[PDB]
Design a protein around this motif. Sequence first.
Motif, PDB file in Angstrom:
ATOM      1  N   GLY A 266      15.275  22.348  19.930  1.00 19.87           N
ATOM      2  CA  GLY A 266      16.588  22.868  20.068  1.00 19.87           C
ATOM      3  C   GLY A 266      16.929  23.508  18.680  1.00 19.87           C
ATOM      4  O   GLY A 266      17.003  22.842  17.608  1.00 19.87           O
ATOM      5  N   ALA A 267      17.135  24.807  18.726  1.00 20.55           N
ATOM      6  CA  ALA A 267      17.269  25.674  17.531  1.00 20.55           C
ATOM      7  C   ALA A 267      18.599  26.355  17.427  1.00 20.55           C
ATOM      8  O   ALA A 267      18.864  27.033  16.436  1.00 20.55           O
ATOM      9  CB  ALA A 267      16.142  26.680  17.532  1.00 20.55           C
ATOM     10  N   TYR A 295      20.811  26.058  12.839  1.00 24.55           N
ATOM     11  CA  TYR A 295      19.404  25.812  13.134  1.00 24.55           C
ATOM     12  C   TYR A 295      19.085  24.676  14.147  1.00 24.55           C
ATOM     13  O   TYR A 295      17.953  24.230  14.258  1.00 24.55           O
ATOM     14  CB  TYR A 295      18.628  25.603  11.798  1.00 24.55           C
ATOM     15  N   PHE A 296      20.140  24.313  14.876  1.00 20.83           N
ATOM     16  CA  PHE A 296      20.056  23.335  15.948  1.00 20.83           C
ATOM     17  C   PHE A 296      21.015  23.686  17.075  1.00 20.83           C
ATOM     18  O   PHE A 296      21.978  24.402  16.886  1.00 20.83           O
ATOM     19  CB  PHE A 296      20.320  21.895  15.452  1.00 20.83           C
ATOM     20  N   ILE A 317      18.108  19.983  17.746  1.00 22.47           N
ATOM     21  CA  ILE A 317      17.687  18.874  16.910  1.00 22.47           C
ATOM     22  C   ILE A 317      17.603  19.309  15.485  1.00 22.47           C
ATOM     23  O   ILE A 317      17.183  20.462  15.219  1.00 22.47           O
ATOM     24  CB  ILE A 317      16.331  18.339  17.424  1.00 22.47           C
TER      25      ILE A 317
HETATM   26  K   LIG Z   1      15.900  22.667  15.047  1.00 25.58           K
END
Ligand SMILES: [K+]
Length: 731
Positions: A266-267, A295-296, A317
């Motif tokens: 998950g980005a 970035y999650f 994440i």
């Molecule tokens: K990530």
Amino acid sequence: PSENYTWKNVRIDGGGFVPGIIFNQKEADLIYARTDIGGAYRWNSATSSWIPLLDWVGWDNWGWNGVMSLATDAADPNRVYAAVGMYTNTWDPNNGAILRSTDRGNTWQATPLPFKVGGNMPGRGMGERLAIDPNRNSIIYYGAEGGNGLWRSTDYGATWAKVSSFTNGGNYAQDPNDPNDYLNKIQGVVWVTFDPASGSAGNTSQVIYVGVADTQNAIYRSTDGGTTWSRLAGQPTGFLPHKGVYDAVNGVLYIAYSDTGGPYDGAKGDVWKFTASSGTWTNISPIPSSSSDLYFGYSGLTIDRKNPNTLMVASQIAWWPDAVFFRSTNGGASWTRIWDWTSYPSRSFRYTMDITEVPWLNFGNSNPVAPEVSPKLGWMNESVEIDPHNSNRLMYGTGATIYATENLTSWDSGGQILLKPMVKGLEETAVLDVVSPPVGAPVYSALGAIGGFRHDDLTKVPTSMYTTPNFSSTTSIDFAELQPATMVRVGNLDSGGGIGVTTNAGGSWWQGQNPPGVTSGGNVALAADGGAIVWAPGGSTNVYLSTTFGSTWTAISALPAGAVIEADRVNPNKFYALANGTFYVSTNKGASFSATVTAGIPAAARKFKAVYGREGDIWLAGGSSTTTYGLWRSTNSGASFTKLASVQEADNVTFGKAATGATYPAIYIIGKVDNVRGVFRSTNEGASWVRINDDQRQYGNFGEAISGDPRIYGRLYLGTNGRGLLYGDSA
Ligand SMILES: [K+]
Ligand SMILES: [Br-]
């Protein structure tokens, strides 16, 4: 023919992924946890421990230890439901089911579903897929995988059918072209959330929200009690909804989105608020996807029911530097965070963490490199949940544990919260190998994910997993029978494999060198006097001998790669190997092997063991329903074997202390004897057997690793795949 036994977990505490924690909305202290491979649990507040509810799942229905969703009935807290099944590819041959209970999971009845359930599949942290109407509790929904859509029961879970009016089953798979056939399944209809103010007790709730893993149609709603459904107007697109939480006090739905189904990635994502009276959408992300540096994505969404202007959400994440948790006390208009950068790589913290009860959660690393700390806050934190009866309590799952706080509102006054593990009784590891030496500690475990341990006291959590080397998974461990302080273990690390050795029973280890081509641990054997190691690594083209205690290696010419290796327990010059229906023997301390038997042993067999105190006595278990199956013994150092008539099927074998007055060690098998599947003991060399487990203590796909105890009559160390390491004693 049963003997009364007592079964307990060797104490480790946690060790696997907890994708869902579920609090009952009306009864305080009533909490459940669902796991991906290890069944489900209910918390016991009187004993401060979790109680396993699915240990009656057995050999043929093993996939039902995968728990994709669970719902506990607010209107009737004795009622609980689970959606179970483990894989939606070929690894689980069975369909899923809905289990129903009226006694909090002590007993269940099953209703099979006409499709699979993916308890250990991608997307398993999204949920809850199962939801009970809070006003008319005979009505239960289930969001299914595969594009099967939305399913429903109107009889307290006894019968299920497809909701014909719900016509979007979802169209996202993590990787639709995955050649491994694991990342390629349609994740489907991912949660169902009721508006409880849309009915009253005894009458059907009219307003229902449903999340769908479909970037362009993530959210659906019914306003007529599930007769019709439509997409919610004005909703955002581009992302998948991990959680949908509804607050009837303010009349708002909160949704946490991510760009993948989770749980390992998950980005990018967002958190949104839908106000039901006006139909307005508001982006309340702590950091929205329009920000270039996000970035999650988001998960771990929870509302404080006692004070519903308060909510939390979490990173899905952030592996680095750690998870981030966010808290708002104003309905998402502003947030603070559980840690902040000061001057990189330093951070300030709104929490402290005490792992005294589960000390191996620092992963053996008490010198972390900033910006990491050890232990970490977490990862795979899809389920983060405030107690609906106590704004000070929160629990969350990680890939290794459950952490909890009892002073959460300390955050609000500028203080620190305290986090501690809360996993006593929740035993979730997969056991890969296990040994019980005749002196020192009673047992050593070799575990997936967290390495494994010397267990000095079966009632006490070990201080650390093995280090130097620290494997993520220890695949095989052995001790020199005539010198048991000398031990070896192999396993996985840093994307390949390695070997660890010790001469002080694991007081300290050191890492050996590797032969060529190692990609995973494989399996290992140690000569009876400690003077030679035979290692069959994963990936390698050969099996290798060391006479230098792991410093250097030489290829063995005759063995197939990946053969199962075992030492004789008496004669240090003898080793054995098994692969694909051929048995091999070495009489020169592992330098060369020759094939002795090429017929009558099932091709599928891959477990065998030499008996302590009995040179050249070997028992072998394996087979399949479509070939041949059973238990074989050799008393001539593997020159030939004879099948035991008294066993129909056997999957593993081990030995333990003899019965009083008996002339041979007790023998323990995983198998089928006289049309009964279970765990069996023989104290007369295989002539007859007694069942030592029972129909409530079956543990699914167990028995990959087992060991008897040479010092303790009747004891078996029984490994499981998701329920930890058990020990059974005669009662
Ligand atoms: K990530
Ligand atoms: Br990351």
